[PDB]
Design a binder for this molecule. Structure first.
Ligand SMILES: O=P(O)(O)O[C@@H]1[C@H](O)[C@H](O)[C@@H](OP(=O)(O)O)[C@H](OP(=O)(O)O)[C@H]1O
Lengths: 739, 599, 54
C-alpha cells in the first residue's frame, strides 16, 4: 500500500519504482495492483512495455484462474493519459485469442444466458467487488477498448465473440443491471457502428432501433426517478454519456441514409428527440453534459430535416427554437530560487561546451600529458590512448551502452570543424588548455589518422553487430563524418574491409534489411515515422562512399563477390517509387503525396541515385533503367508534373527537386550509346509535354528573385536531355528545332 | 515428377481437417467449397472441371484500384483510365514473358479458376459467411491485391529458395491476410455436404496434384478435358444424345438448314478425356492412346452395347452413366498420314474404334422414332469391318457457348428441384427466396443486359439474342417455368388468394416466370410455337395480376399464324368480360393491339 | 535427380528394407515408459510409403 501511495501521480517515482520490476514480476494479486499503480496515467512506460510482461500475465490468468485485477491492469496499460497504444492493444488481443475459451468466456448460449441472469439477480442491489459478473464486465470493456483501434481483424473477432443477437437479448431483457448495459452499449459503440467492415450489419438492421427504444425507456426511468428522488447515479451517467454517444454515432454516420424507412423508426426518432428535449429542459443537466446533449440534439435535427420527417408542428417549432437559441516567505523563497536557477543555467551555457571542447582536444593530443622521453609518451606518439580507446569501445559495446555512445559522439566531434563559443568561453578554453596541456586539410588529416588507428574496423563492427538504435545511428554518423569531403583513402580502407572480412554479408545484410523495413513502413503509412528518419543517414553514407566517382565501390554496392549478393541501388529506386506513390503518383497524383516533411528525403535519394549512375557506371545504369518495379517513370513525372500543393507556398524546393531529377536522367544517359535507354525514357516522356515544360521553364524564370536555383538551368538541363533523346526520336528532333 | 512451371493446370487437394478438392459452385455464386463426399485422390469427382486451377505470376493493381475509387475532373478520370489500360497491357506483356518459369517456395502465385476464369482472392475487410472470425475468400474475375499468395513449405524438407515439385504439400498464405487458407467444417445450408474455405490460422496442407503441363496447353492440339462436337462428314450431321421416351438415346440429328454446319445445338457437346495411369492427370492426347467421351448436359459416357435387332450391325451406341467400365474406351485412328505419333491436331477427321469388341463406328439409315412424323434421329452402330468413308470431324466449340451452357445447366437443375418441391406441397421461405433469385438471374441472362438494379418485372432489350434463346428452350428451362406456373394451382395457392398478403410472394414469383416466358419469344419462331403450345394454361389464368395478358400479346404481336389460331370468340369474350370487371384502359389498349399486327 | 548419379551429401533420403519390402517410420511410443521424462522413441517399418518421413 505504501509503495502504491508513493508512486501515484508522479511519473518520476513511477519510473524509479518500475526500474526494480523483478520484485513485482511474480504471482499475486497485491503485486498486480501495485504494478498497475506503477503503470497508471503514464504513456512512456506503457508504450515501451515489454511483450514478455503481457505474455506472462496472460499465462497467469490462464493458469491460476480468472481474476479482475489482471484485466484491470491490461485496461490501464491500453489507455494512458487519454491516448491508446496500438502495440499493446495488438499484443493483448492476440494473446487473448490464442489463450482459448478458458481465458475469454462469453455467455452467448441459452444456458450461459440463464447463468448470466442468475449471477445478475444474485447481485441485483449492486455488483460485488469480486465475482464472475465483474470479470465478464471487465473483459467486455477491455475488448471494446481494444477494438477502438483501427484493426479490421480485431473488430471481426469481437463481432464473432458477441453477436448482435446476444446484446439485444440481454440488454432488452425485462431485468438488466446498469453495469452490463453500460459495458454492452460501449461494446456496440466501439465495435459495431464504427468499423472498417463493408457489410456493417448494424446500419442495415432493426436491432439498433430496439436498443434506441430501450435507451428511451431508460431515460424515462431516470426522469421519473429524479421526479421522485429515486436518483441512481449509474443510470444517470449511463444515459448521459454512452446512450448519447451511441445515438450520435449511429445517426451521424453517412451510411444510415436508407436505414430510416419504417414509420415506426420515425416514431422512435421522435421519441428520442423529445427525450433529449425533456433532458435539456430540466436544470439538473450539467454544463459539460449540456454541451454533449446539445451536440446530439443538433445531429438528430440535421438527420430529421434531411429525411424531411413531418414531426408534430408544436414540438417541431420547439426544436427549431432550441436550434436557433444554441446557434446564437516560503513561496517567495521558492520563486526566487527558481529565478536564480534559470539565470545560472542561462549564464553557464557556453562554459560546458568549452569544457567538452577541451576534452576533445586533450583526447586528440594525449602525448603532451606525459613527460618527454617516457615510455608512455612514446606509446602515445604512435597511437596509444586513441588505439586503446577505439579497440575497447567494441569490447564495452554490451557492458555499457552509454559509455559507447559517449565515446562514439566525442569521436564524431573530433572530426568536426572548430567553432567559437564566445569571449568568456574562449577565455575559459584557453585557461583549461594551458593548464592541462603544455580548412579541409585538417579534417582530412584527422580522418587519415583515425583510418590508421582502426576507426573503420570499429564502425564496421558496430553496424554489423548492434541491437541498440542509438549506437547504430551514432556509428552511421561516424562513418559519414569520416567519409565527409569525399576522401579517397577512407573509401579505399572501407572497400578493403568489406572485400577482405569474414563477416562480409552481415554488414550489407543489416543495411539491406533496414532499407526493406523503411519501404514497408513508408507503404503502410500511405511528423514522420521512426523507421523513415534513419533513412537519411544511410543514403548520405552511401552517397559519400560512392562520391568522387569510385568505380570499384559502385560495382561492389551493386553486387558483391560473396556467395549471397545484395544490391542497394535497386532497393533505393524501389523506395523512391513507394514514397512517390508509384504509378498513381506518376500519373498526376504525385503532388498530393509529396509534402514539406518528406521533400528533403526525396532530394537525398535522388542525389544518391545520380551518384550511383555517375562515373559513368554502365551496370548501375542498366539496373536502374531496367528495374522490375518500373520506377524510372516517376523520375520523369517529377519534371513533367508540377507539384500543385507545394508550388503554391514553396517553390525553391520544387525547383531543387526538378533540377535533381534532370541531373539524374542526364547521368543515366551520360555515356549510353545504345537505344534501350532512349526507348525506355521516351515511353514515359511525351515529347510534346517535354517541349511544353521547356517553354514553361523559360517563361517561369521570372521568379528568380525568391529562388537560389534559377529555373533557367533546370530548363537548360531538360533541353540537353531532350537533345540526347532526340537521336532516337525523329518527332522529338523535329519539335526541338526552332520556329 | 517435375517442377510446377507457371501456366500448368493443377488440382488442389485439401488434406487436413476435411479432405477434398476445392471446388466452386456454378452460376454467379462466388463461394468456394471443399466437398469430401464427391471423391478422393484415388477416385476423382464426377465433375472434374471445377477443381482445376492455373498458376499465374504477380499482377499489379495499383492504378486499377485508384480508378475503381475514382469511379466509386473529367481529364483526370480519362488519364486514370488510360493508366489502367497501359498498366493492364504491361501486365499481359509481363505474364507472357514470364510464362514457363519455375515456381520456388516463398514466391508469389495467383490461382485462376479455368472454368469461371476468376482469381481466388481473399478479402480481409469482410468476415466469412459461416465463420465470422475468419476473413472472406471468394472468386473475383478482375482480381485485386488479395489474389496474391505466398506458397510456403508444409514439410521441413523444402526451404525457401527451393523449387516446388508436383505431388508435394504446401501452404497458401495471402499477401495481405497473412492467414493460411483453411477448409472449415461448417457445412453450407444451401448445399449439403459442402464445407467452407476461409483465410484463418490453421494447419491444413494443400497437396498440389498435376493435371496439365504448360507445354501441353497449346490451342492447336486436342487436349484432355477439352470439349468438341463430333461432326459427320458423309451425312453432314452432328452427333447428339437426348431424352426420347424415358431413356437417353444417342443418334445423328437431321436438319433442314441449307448449311448443315450451322445446326449448332448444346446437346451435341462432348468432352474428351485422355485415359492415363494417374486418374487426376489429363494432358495432350496422342494417336496411340485411349479416349473417353462425356456429355456435359447429362454427364453420361458414350459406349457400345449388344443390339437386339441382330440387322447387319452387331452392337449399337448408347449412353451409360458410369465411366469406369471398359466398354467406354475408344481409340482414334487418322484418315491421312501423320509424322510419327505426335499430338492429334485440332479440327482433324478421325475414326472411332472400340477396344473391347474391336469394332468400328458406323452410321445407319434406320430412324429410331419410326412412330413419329418427320424422323430426325438416325441410329448409329458399330460394324466389325472398317469403312474409310466414315470419319468423324472433331470441331471445337467457342468458350462462350460453354459458359452459357454451364450457367443454364445448374439453373435448370434447381428449377427442377423447385418444381418437385412445389408438387410435393411444402416449401420454405429460404427456398422461395432462392428460387426468386434464380428467376431474376435467368431473366437477366436471357436479356443479356448488364444488371443495374432495375425493376425485375421491367427491362428493355434492343437486340434479342438467338443462341441464348435456343439454349434456353432446349435445356428444358422453359418447361420447368411452365411447371412452376402450373403445379401450384393443382391447392397450395389459389388465384383469388394471390391478392391476399399471405400469398403475395407467390404472385411476384409467378410474374417473374411470365417474364421469363416473354424474352424467349422475340423474333424466334420456334420458341413462340413451343410456348404457344400451352396457350390454354395462360388463357385460364389471364385476368389476375400475373402479366399473362402481356405475355400473350407479345406472343401474338408478330406471328400471324398464332394470331388466327389463338384468337376466336371465346378468348375475345374473356377479354370483354375482364374489361367489364376492371373497367381499366390497359385492357382496352391490349384489345386494340390485338386488332392489328405488323401495321 | 538427373539419371542415377552419385548420392549428393547432406540430402534427404528414405530407407527401405529389401527383405520385407517395408519403409522405415517413426513412432510416438516411448520404450522407457517405466522411467521419468522419456527420451527414447520407438522406430518401426510400415509396408506403406510415407513421403513426410525422410
Ligand atoms: O428460319 P425459320 O423460319 O425460323 O426456320 C428455321 C428452320 O427452317 C427450322 O425450322 C429450324 O431448324 P431444325 O430443322 O434444326 O429444327 C430452325 O431453328 P433451329 O435454330 O432450332 O435450327 C428455324 O429457325
Amino acid at each position: 500500500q505504501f509503495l502504491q501511495k508513493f508512486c501515484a501521480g508522479n511519473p518520476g517515482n513511477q519510473a524509479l519504482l518500475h526500474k526494480h520490476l523483478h520484485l513485482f514480476l511474480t504471482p499475486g494479486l497485491l503485486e498486480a495492483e501495485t504494478m498497475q499503480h506503477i503503470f497508471l496515467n503514464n504513456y512512456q512506460l506503457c508504450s515501451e512495455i515489454s511483450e514478455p510482461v503481457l505474455q506472462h500475465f496472460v499465462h497467469l490468468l490462464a493458469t491460476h484462474g480468472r481474476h479482475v485485477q489482471y484485466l484491470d491492469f491490461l485496461h490501464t496499460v491500453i489507455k494512458a493519459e487519454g491516448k491508446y497504444v496500438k502495440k499493446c492493444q495488438d499484443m493483448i488481443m492476440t494473446e487473448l485469442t490464442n489463450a482459448g475459451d478458458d481465458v475469454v468466456v462469453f455467455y452467448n448460449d441459452k444456458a450461459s444466458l440463464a447463468h448470466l441472469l442468475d449471477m445478475m439477480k444474485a447481485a441485483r442491489d449492486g455488483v460485488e467487488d469480486h465475482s464472475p459478473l465483474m470479470y465478464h464486465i471487465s473483459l467486455v470493456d477491455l475488448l471494446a477498448a481494444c477494438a477502438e483501434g483501427k484493426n479490421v481483424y480485431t473488430e471481426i473477432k469481437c463481432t464473432s465473440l458477441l453477436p448482435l443477437e446476444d446484446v439485444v437479448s440481454v440488454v432488452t431483457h425485462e431485468d438488466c443491471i446498469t453495469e452490463v448495459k453500460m459495458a454492452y452499449v460501449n461494446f456496440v459503440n466501439h465495435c459495431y457502428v464504427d468499423t472498417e467492415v463493408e457489410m456493417k450489419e448494424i446500419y442495415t438492421s432493426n436491432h439498433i432501433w430496439t436498443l434506441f427504444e430501450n435507451f428511451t425507456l431508460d431515460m424515462a426511468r431516470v426522469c421519473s426517478k429524479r421526479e421522485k428522488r429515486v436518483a441512481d447515479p449509474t443510470l444517470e451517467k449511463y444515459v448521459l454519456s454512452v446512450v448519447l454517444d451511441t445515438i450520435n454515432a449511429f445517426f451521424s454516420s453517412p451510411f444510415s441514409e436508407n436505414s430510416t424507412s419504417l414509420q415506426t423508426h420515425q416514431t422512435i426518432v421522435v421519441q428520442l428527440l423529445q427525450s433529449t428535449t425533456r433532458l435539456l429542459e430540466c436544470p439538473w443537466l450539467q454544463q459539460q453534459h449540456k454541451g454533449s446533449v446539445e451536440a446530439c440534439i443538433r445531429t438528430l435535427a440535421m438527420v430529421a430535416k434531411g429525411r424531411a420527417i413531418l414531426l408534430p408542428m408544436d414540438l417541431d417549432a420547439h426544436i427549431s427554437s432550441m436550434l436557433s437559441s444554441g446557434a446564437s516567505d516560503y513561496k517567495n523563497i521558492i520563486e526566487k530560487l527558481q529565478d536564480i536557477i534559470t539565470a545560472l543555467e542561462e549564464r553557464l551555457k557556453p562554459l560546458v561546451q568549452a569544457e567538452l571542447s577541451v576534452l576533445v582536444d586533450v583526447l586528440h593530443w594525449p602525448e603532451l600529458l606525459f613527460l618527454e622521453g617516457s615510455e608512455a609518451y612514446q606509446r602515445c606518439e604512435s597511437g596509444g590512448f586513441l588505439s586503446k580507446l577505439i579497440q575497447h569501445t567494441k569490447d564495452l559495446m554490451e557492458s555499457e551502452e552509454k559509455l559507447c555512445i559517449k565515446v562514439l559522439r566525442t569521436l564524431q566531434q573530433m572530426l568536426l570543424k572548430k567553432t567559437k563559443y564566445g569571449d568568456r568561453g574562449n577565455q575559459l578554453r584557453k585557461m583549461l588548455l594551458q593548464n592541462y596541456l603544455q580548412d579541409w586539410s585538417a579534417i582530412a588529416a584527422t580522418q587519415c589518422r583515425l583510418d590508421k588507428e582502426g576507426a573503420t574496423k570499429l564502425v564496421c563492427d558496430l553496424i554489423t553487430s548492434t541491437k541498440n538504435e542509438k549506437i547504430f545511428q551514432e556509428s552511421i554518423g561516424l562513418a559519414i563524418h569520416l567519409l565527409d569531403g569525399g576522401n579517397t583513402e577512407i573509401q579505399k580502407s572501407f572497400h578493403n574491409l568489406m572485400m577482405s572480412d569474414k563477416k562480409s554479408e552481415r554488414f550489407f545484410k543489416v543495411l539491406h534489411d533496414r532499407m526493406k523495413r523503411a519501404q514497408q513502413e513508408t507503404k503502410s503509412t500511405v511528423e514522420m515515422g521512426t523507421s523513415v528518419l534513419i533513412m537519411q543517414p544511410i543514403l548520405r553514407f552511401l552517397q559519400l562512399l560512392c562520391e568522387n566517382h569510385n568505380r570499384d565501390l559502385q560495382n561492389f554496392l551493386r553486387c558483391q563477390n560473396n556467395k549471397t549478393n545484395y544490391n542497394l541501388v535497386c532497393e533505393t529506386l524501389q523506395f523512391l517509387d513507394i514514397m512517390c506513390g508509384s504509378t498513381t503518383g506518376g500519373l498526376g497524383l504525385l503532388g498530393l503525396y509529396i509534402n514539406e516533411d518528406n521533400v528533403g528525403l526525396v532530394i537525398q535519394t535522388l542525389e544518391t541515385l545520380t551518384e550511383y549512375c555517375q562515373g559513368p557506371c554502365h551496370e548501375n545504369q542498366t539496373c536502374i533503367v531496367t528495374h522490375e518495379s518500373n520506377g524510372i517513370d516517376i523520375i520523369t513525372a517529377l519534371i513533367l508534373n508540377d507539384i500543385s500543393p507545394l508550388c503554391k507556398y514553396r517553390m525553391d524546393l520544387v525547383l531543387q527537386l526538378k533540377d535533381n531529377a534532370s541531373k539524374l536522367l542526364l547521368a543515366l544517359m551520360e555515356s549510353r550509346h545504345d537505344s534501350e535507354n532512349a526507348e525506355r525514357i521516351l515511353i514515359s516522356l511525351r515529347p510534346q509535354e517535354l517541349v511544353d515544360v521547356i517553354k514553361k521553364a523559360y517563361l517561369q524564370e521570372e521568379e528568380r528573385e525568391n529562388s537560389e536555383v534559377s529555373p533557367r538551368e533546370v530548363g537548360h538541363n531538360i533541353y540537353i536531355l531532350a537533345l540526347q533523346l532526340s537521336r532516337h526520336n525523329k518527332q522529338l528532333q523535329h519539335l526541338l528545332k526552332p520556329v | 515428377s517435375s517442377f510446377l512451371h507457371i501456366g500448368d493446370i493443377v488440382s488442389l487437394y485439401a488434406e487436413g481437417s476435411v479432405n477434398g478438392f476445392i471446388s466452386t459452385l456454378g452460376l454467379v455464386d462466388d463461394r468456394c467449397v471443399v466437398e469430401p463426399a464427391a471423391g478422393d485422390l484415388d477416385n476423382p469427382p464426377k465433375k472434374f472441371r471445377d477443381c482445376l486451377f492455373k498458376v499465374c505470376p504477380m499482377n499489379r493493381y495499383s492504378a486499377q484500384k485508384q480508378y475503381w475509387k475514382a469511379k466509386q475532373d473529367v481529364v483526370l478520370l480519362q488519364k486514370l483510365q488510360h493508366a489502367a489500360q497501359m498498366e493492364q497491357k504491361q501486365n499481359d506483356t509481363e505474364n507472357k514473358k514470364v510464362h514457363g518459369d519455375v515456381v520456388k517456395y516463398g514466391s508469389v502465385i495467383q490461382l485462376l479458376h479455368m472454368k469461371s476464369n476468376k482469381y481466388l482472392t481473399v478479402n480481409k475487410r469482410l468476415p466469412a459467411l459461416l465463420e465470422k472470425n475468419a476473413m472472406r475468400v471468394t472468386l473475383d474475375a478482375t482480381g485485386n491485391e488479395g489474389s496474391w499468395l505466398f506458397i510456403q513449405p508444409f514439410w521441413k524438407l523444402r526451404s525457401n529458395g527451393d523449387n516446388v515439385v508436383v505431388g508435394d504439400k504446401v501452404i497458401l498464405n495471402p499477401v495481405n491476410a497473412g492467414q493460411p487458407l483453411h477448409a472449415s467444417n461448417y457445412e453450407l445450408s444451401d448445399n449439403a455436404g459442402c464445407k467452407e474455405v476461409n483465410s484463418v490460422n490453421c494447419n491444413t496442407s494443400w497437396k498440389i496434384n498435376l493435371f496439365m503441363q504448360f507445354r501441353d496447353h497449346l490451342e492447336e492440339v486436342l487436349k484432355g478435358g477439352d470439349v468438341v462436337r463430333l461432326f459427320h462428314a458423309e451425312q453432314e450431321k452432328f452427333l447428339t444424345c437426348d431424352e426420347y421416351k424415358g431413356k437417353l438415346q444417342v443418334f445423328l440429328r437431321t436438319t433442314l438448314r441449307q448449311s448443315a454446319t450451322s445446326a449448332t445445338s448444346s446437346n451435341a457437346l462432348w468432352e474428351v478425356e485422355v485415359v492415363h495411369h494417374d486418374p487426376c492427370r489429363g494432358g495432350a492426347g496422342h494417336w496411340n492412346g485411349l479416349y473417353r467421351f462425356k456429355h456435359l448436359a447429362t454427364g453420361n459416357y458414350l459406349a457400345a452395347e449388344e443390339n437386339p435387332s441382330y440387322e447387319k450391325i452387331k452392337y449399337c451406341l448408347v449412353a451409360v452413366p458410369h465411366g469406369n467400365d471398359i466398354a467406354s474406351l475408344f481409340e482414334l485412328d487418322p484418315t491421312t498420314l501423320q509424322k510419327t505419333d505426335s499430338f492429334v491436331p485440332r479440327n482433324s477427321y478421325v475414326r472411332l474404334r472400340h477396344l473391347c469388341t474391336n469394332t468400328w463406328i458406323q452410321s445407319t439409315n434406320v430412324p429410331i422414332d419410326i412412330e413419329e412424323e418427320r424422323p430426325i434421329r438416325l441410329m448409329l452402330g458399330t460394324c466389325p469391318t472398317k469403312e474409310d468413308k466414315e470419319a468423324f470431324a472433331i470441331v471445337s466449340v467457342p468458350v462462350s457457348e460453354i459458359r452459357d451452357l454451364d450457367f443454364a445447366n445448374d439453373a435448370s437443375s434447381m428449377l427442377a428441384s423447385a418444381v418437385e418441391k412445389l408438387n410435393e406441397g411444402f416449401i420454405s421461405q429460404n427456398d422461395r427466396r432462392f428460387v426468386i433469385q434464380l428467376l431474376e438471374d435467368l431473366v437477366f441472362f436471357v436479356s443479356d443486359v448488364p444488371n443495374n438494379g432495375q425493376n425485375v418485372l421491367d427491362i428493355m432489350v434492343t437486340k434479342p439474342n438467338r443462341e441464348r434463346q435456343k439454349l434456353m428452350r432446349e435445356q428444358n428451362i422453359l418447361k420447368q417455368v411452365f411447371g412452376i406456373l402450373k403445379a401450384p394451382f393443382r391447392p397450395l395457392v389459389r388465384l383469388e388468394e394471390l391478392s391476399d398478403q399471405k400469398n403475395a410472394p407467390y404472385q411476384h414469383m409467378f410474374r417473374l416466370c411470365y417474364r421469363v416466358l416473354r424474352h424467349s419469344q422475340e423474333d424466334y419462331r420456334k420458341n413462340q410455337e413451343h410456348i404457344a403450345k400451352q396457350f390454354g394454361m395462360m388463357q385460364s389464368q389471364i385476368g389476375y395480376d400475373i402479366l399473362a395478358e402481356d405475355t400473350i400479346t407479345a406472343l401474338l404481336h408478330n406471328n400471324r399464324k398464332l394470331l388466327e389460331k389463338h384468337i376466336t370468340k371465346t378468348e375475345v369474350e374473356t377479354f370483354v368480360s375482364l374489361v367489364r370487371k376492371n373497367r381499366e384502359p390497359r385492357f382496352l389498349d391490349y384489345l386494340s393491339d390485338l386488332c392489328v399486327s405488323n401495321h
